[PDB]
Design an enzyme around this catalytic site. Structure first.
Site, PDB file in Angstrom:
ATOM      1  N   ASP A  37      96.317 -37.435  34.927  1.00 56.68           N
ATOM      2  CA  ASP A  37      94.816 -36.695  34.552  1.00 56.68           C
ATOM      3  C   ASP A  37      94.308 -36.932  35.243  1.00 56.68           C
ATOM      4  O   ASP A  37      93.573 -37.594  35.737  1.00 56.68           O
ATOM      5  CB  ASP A  37      95.285 -36.532  33.484  1.00 56.68           C
ATOM      6  CG  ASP A  37      94.283 -35.672  32.812  1.00 56.68           C
ATOM      7  OD1 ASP A  37      95.000 -34.315  32.958  1.00 56.68           O
ATOM      8  OD2 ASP A  37      94.295 -35.784  30.917  1.00 56.68           O
TER       9      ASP A  37
ATOM     10  N   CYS B 198      99.150 -27.695  32.169  1.00 56.19           N
ATOM     11  CA  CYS B 198      98.573 -29.645  31.937  1.00 56.19           C
ATOM     12  C   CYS B 198      98.087 -29.941  31.266  1.00 56.19           C
ATOM     13  O   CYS B 198      98.944 -29.546  29.366  1.00 56.19           O
ATOM     14  CB  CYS B 198      97.619 -29.767  33.164  1.00 56.19           C
ATOM     15  SG  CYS B 198      96.106 -29.027  33.414  1.00 56.19           S
ATOM     16  N   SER B 199      97.492 -30.794  30.543  1.00 55.64           N
ATOM     17  CA  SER B 199      97.535 -31.059  29.583  1.00 55.64           C
ATOM     18  C   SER B 199      96.240 -29.938  28.334  1.00 55.64           C
ATOM     19  O   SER B 199      96.218 -29.810  27.239  1.00 55.64           O
ATOM     20  CB  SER B 199      96.549 -32.134  28.907  1.00 55.64           C
ATOM     21  OG  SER B 199      95.748 -32.710  28.136  1.00 55.64           O
ATOM     22  N   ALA B 200      95.138 -29.465  29.303  1.00 60.51           N
ATOM     23  CA  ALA B 200      93.800 -28.611  28.640  1.00 60.51           C
ATOM     24  C   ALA B 200      94.341 -27.091  29.964  1.00 60.51           C
ATOM     25  O   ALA B 200      94.041 -26.595  28.805  1.00 60.51           O
ATOM     26  CB  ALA B 200      93.010 -28.849  29.796  1.00 60.51           C
ATOM     27  N   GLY B 201      95.399 -27.113  30.379  1.00 58.32           N
ATOM     28  CA  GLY B 201      95.443 -25.710  31.716  1.00 58.32           C
ATOM     29  C   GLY B 201      94.324 -25.365  32.154  1.00 58.32           C
ATOM     30  O   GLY B 201      94.308 -24.245  32.525  1.00 58.32           O
ATOM     31  N   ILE B 202      93.421 -26.441  32.888  1.00 62.75           N
ATOM     32  CA  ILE B 202      92.770 -26.390  34.157  1.00 62.75           C
ATOM     33  C   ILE B 202      92.180 -26.563  34.851  1.00 62.75           C
ATOM     34  O   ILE B 202      92.539 -26.296  35.698  1.00 62.75           O
ATOM     35  CB  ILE B 202      90.938 -26.178  33.022  1.00 62.75           C
ATOM     36  CG1 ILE B 202      91.069 -27.440  32.907  1.00 62.75           C
ATOM     37  CG2 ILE B 202      91.218 -24.598  31.999  1.00 62.75           C
ATOM     38  CD1 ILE B 202      89.304 -26.638  31.812  1.00 62.75           C
ATOM     39  N   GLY B 203      93.382 -28.259  34.936  1.00 66.13           N
ATOM     40  CA  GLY B 203      92.845 -29.040  36.046  1.00 66.13           C
ATOM     41  C   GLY B 203      93.828 -29.161  36.769  1.00 66.13           C
ATOM     42  O   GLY B 203      93.903 -28.524  38.281  1.00 66.13           O
ATOM     43  N   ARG B 204      94.528 -29.613  36.888  1.00 57.91           N
ATOM     44  CA  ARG B 204      95.870 -29.799  36.867  1.00 57.91           C
ATOM     45  C   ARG B 204      97.069 -28.300  37.643  1.00 57.91           C
ATOM     46  O   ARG B 204      96.879 -27.685  38.783  1.00 57.91           O
ATOM     47  CB  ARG B 204      96.926 -31.005  37.031  1.00 57.91           C
ATOM     48  CG  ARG B 204      96.406 -31.598  36.868  1.00 57.91           C
ATOM     49  CD  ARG B 204      97.582 -33.419  35.875  1.00 57.91           C
ATOM     50  NE  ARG B 204      97.475 -33.373  34.646  1.00 57.91           N
ATOM     51  CZ  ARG B 204      97.734 -33.704  33.656  1.00 57.91           C
ATOM     52  NH1 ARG B 204      98.793 -34.687  34.678  1.00 57.91           N
ATOM     53  NH2 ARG B 204      97.638 -33.930  32.576  1.00 57.91           N
ATOM     54  N   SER B 205      96.642 -27.452  36.509  1.00 59.79           N
ATOM     55  CA  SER B 205      96.988 -26.133  36.397  1.00 59.79           C
ATOM     56  C   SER B 205      96.444 -24.668  37.056  1.00 59.79           C
ATOM     57  O   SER B 205      97.254 -24.274  38.027  1.00 59.79           O
ATOM     58  CB  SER B 205      97.175 -25.442  34.666  1.00 59.79           C
ATOM     59  OG  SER B 205      97.425 -26.418  33.982  1.00 59.79           O
TER      60      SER B 205
ATOM     61  N   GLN C 249      89.576 -29.166  38.345  1.00 64.35           N
ATOM     62  CA  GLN C 249      88.465 -30.030  37.176  1.00 64.35           C
ATOM     63  C   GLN C 249      87.613 -31.590  38.269  1.00 64.35           C
ATOM     64  O   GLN C 249      86.487 -31.894  37.830  1.00 64.35           O
ATOM     65  CB  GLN C 249      89.386 -30.835  35.478  1.00 64.35           C
ATOM     66  CG  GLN C 249      89.571 -29.631  35.010  1.00 64.35           C
ATOM     67  CD  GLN C 249      88.332 -29.647  33.865  1.00 64.35           C
ATOM     68  OE1 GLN C 249      87.628 -30.292  33.927  1.00 64.35           O
ATOM     69  NE2 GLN C 249      87.373 -28.381  34.773  1.00 64.35           N
TER      70      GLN C 249
HETATM   71  O1  LIG Z   1      95.553 -31.936  31.868  1.00 64.05           O
HETATM   72  C1  LIG Z   1      94.860 -31.724  32.838  1.00 64.05           C
HETATM   73  O2  LIG Z   1      95.062 -31.571  34.299  1.00 64.05           O
HETATM   74  C2  LIG Z   1      93.126 -31.160  32.587  1.00 64.05           C
HETATM   75  O3  LIG Z   1      92.364 -30.959  32.916  1.00 64.05           O
HETATM   76  N1  LIG Z   1      92.870 -32.136  31.446  1.00 64.05           N
HETATM   77  C3  LIG Z   1      91.353 -32.056  31.282  1.00 64.05           C
HETATM   78  S1  LIG Z   1      90.469 -30.654  31.551  1.00 64.05           S
HETATM   79  C4  LIG Z   1      89.355 -31.623  30.316  1.00 64.05           C
HETATM   80  C5  LIG Z   1      90.015 -32.614  29.886  1.00 64.05           C
HETATM   81  C6  LIG Z   1      91.500 -32.766  29.879  1.00 64.05           C
HETATM   82  C7  LIG Z   1      92.297 -33.982  29.716  1.00 64.05           C
HETATM   83  O4  LIG Z   1      93.210 -34.514  29.400  1.00 64.05           O
HETATM   84  O5  LIG Z   1      91.467 -34.683  28.597  1.00 64.05           O
HETATM   85  C8  LIG Z   1      89.488 -32.870  28.337  1.00 64.05           C
HETATM   86  C9  LIG Z   1      88.528 -32.132  27.856  1.00 64.05           C
HETATM   87  O6  LIG Z   1      87.407 -31.989  29.001  1.00 64.05           O
HETATM   88  C10 LIG Z   1      87.421 -30.577  30.148  1.00 64.05           C
END
Ligand SMILES: O=C(O)C(=O)Nc1sc2c(c1C(=O)O)CCOC2
Length: 297
Positions: free
Chosen positions: A180, A214-221, A261
């Site tokens: 993450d 991924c967990s949020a659907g933004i960074g890894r995805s 992210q």
């Molecule tokens: O799973 C990911 O790659 C991802 O984008 N995760 C994110 S983006 C994000 C968070 C997380 C997290 O996992 O806690 C927590 C809240 O802020 C933005």
């Protein structure tokens, strides 16, 4: 070239400011349904929501809300659905989404447990003999088999719509060593995983959009989708130098907030697309080298 851009950016060392800039330019559209009080327990992070215009609507009368978006890449001609890691009350919604949207593939870039916390529900059966029934959206799901590699596993799942008893096979591509808010171990193992998803047929416009989470659907995805679209775009024309990486990330952030992210994930995207261009430009021999490098077994 993106490659000269890369070298400029590195030598000045200004990835952070570049990324800063993307963040400042990215679109901002409303997320009112995500913010309705009824939908509180359907979102995993307060500060990560689907935009209203691109969100996925469930075909239910009750509450059509899920934290998912359709990223629709017009020029590339590829769409994905990005979504958060399913919560314990939304795994039934998640599979309803897969069913209604007709996806053949699900790409999961996180583990259930990360950094001491539960990043995602266990939303698929870990064994054949113990299927999941999701009574709420009336769906049943069975592990058919899996293929476990050192850094990733591919499962075959059977999804049944109990109401009509129609069944479909879903492929699940689980990357289990992408931290993450980190990057893959290398471009080689990233590309190795990406080409495995591509080979399988799941990205392939006869199916619904692939689901990427991924967990949020933004960074890894976003990182995954950015490299895939960049390579696609470059394939249609066989022209690396027509691809603008920043600008394609910006087209994607029209459909979902926050895609990619960190600045080093941005930086990793340039590495990925620059290595993968070797394959798109007609040396298919690098594919096999990625697989060696990746140490997949
Ligand atoms: O799973 C990911 O790659 C991802 O984008 N995760 C994110 S983006 C994000 C968070 C997380 C997290 O996992 O806690 C927590 C809240 O802020 C933005």
């Amino acid at each position: 070239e993106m490659e000269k851009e890369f070298e400029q950016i590195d030598k000045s060392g200004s990835w952070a400011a570049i990324y800063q800039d993307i963040r400042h330019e990215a679109s901002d559209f409303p997320c009112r349904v995500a913010k309705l009080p009824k939908n509180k327990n359907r979102n995993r992070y307060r500060d990560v929501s689907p935009f209203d215009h691109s969100r996925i609507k469930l075909h239910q009368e009750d509450n059509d809300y899920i934290n998912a978006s359709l990223i629709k890449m017009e020029e590339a001609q590829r769409s994905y659905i990005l979504t958060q890691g399913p919560l314990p009350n939304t795994c039934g919604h998640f599979w309803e989404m897969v069913w209604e949207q007709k996806s053949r593939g699900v790409v999961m870039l996180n583990r259930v447990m990360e950094k001491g916390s539960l990043k995602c529900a266990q939303y698929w059966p870990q064994k054949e003999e113990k299927e999941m029934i999701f009574e709420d959206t009336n769906l049943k799901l069975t592990l058919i088999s899996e293929d476990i590699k050192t850094y990733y596993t591919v499962r075959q799942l059977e999804l049944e719509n109990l109401t009509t008893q129609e069944t479909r096979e879903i492929l699940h591509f689980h990357y289990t060593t992408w931290p993450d808010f980190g990057v893959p171990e290398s471009p080689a193992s990233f590309l190795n995983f990406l080409f495995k998803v591509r080979e399988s047929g799941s990205l392939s416009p006869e199916h619904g959009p692939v689901v990427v989470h991924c967990s949020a659907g933004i960074g890894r995805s976003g990182t995954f989708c950015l490299a895939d679209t960049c390579l696609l775009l470059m394939d249609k024309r066989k022209d690396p130098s027509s691809v603008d990486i920043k600008k394609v990330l910006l087209d994607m952030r029209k459909f979902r907030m926050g895609l990619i992210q960190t600045a080093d994930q941005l930086r990793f995207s340039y590495l990925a697309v620059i290595e993968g261009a070797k394959f798109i430009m007609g040396d298919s021999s690098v594919q096999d080298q990625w697989k060696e490098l990746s140490h997949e077994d």
